[PDB]
Nucleic acid binder design. Structure first.
Length: 97
RNA sequence: UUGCUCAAGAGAAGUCAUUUAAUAAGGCCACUGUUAAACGUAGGUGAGUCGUGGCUUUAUGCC
């Protein structure tokens, strides 16, 4: 049967400066917009969280097609052809060429 | 003085009276703009009115 895992996770309190918007001028301003009650809330992109999850998968030793160098800051592909059967990355996050 | 010399085709008259291009018609039925992504890191400003009034020590600032 089809099974789904939905979840809302709440992070710990602290100072935050993540996923900044365009660094126009000298300021590095946050990614902010409207939320409930019509007040301004700061946002963090979901692509960053997906990248963090993929990096966790890579660091834990699971076989992933995309590998982060952590030194040259370049993403390298283990195999040009995407194989979701073998790679955790392709199975979970999908792919598109 | 020219086969010439002169020489009005002239006077008057409504193309009129009447007539629906009318009756009827669905541009209709179907369509995902699908799939993937770290913001990394450095780019600026245009425009009035004129002589103390409630607080506060003139002071000097609030409305």
């Amino acid at each position: 049967p089809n099974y789904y895992l939905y979840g809302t996770v709440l992070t710990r309190y602290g100072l935050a400066s993540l996923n900044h918007d365009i660094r126009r001028g000298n300021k590095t301003i946050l990614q902010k917009g409207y939320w409930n009650n019509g007040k301004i809330h700061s946002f963090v992109g979901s692509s960053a969280i997906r990248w963090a999850l993929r990096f966790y998968l890579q660091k834990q030793g699971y076989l992933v097609n995309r590998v982060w160098d952590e030194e040259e800051h370049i993403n390298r592909l283990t195999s040009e052809d995407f194989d979701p059967e073998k790679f955790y990355d392709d199975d979970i996050f999908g792919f598109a060429l």
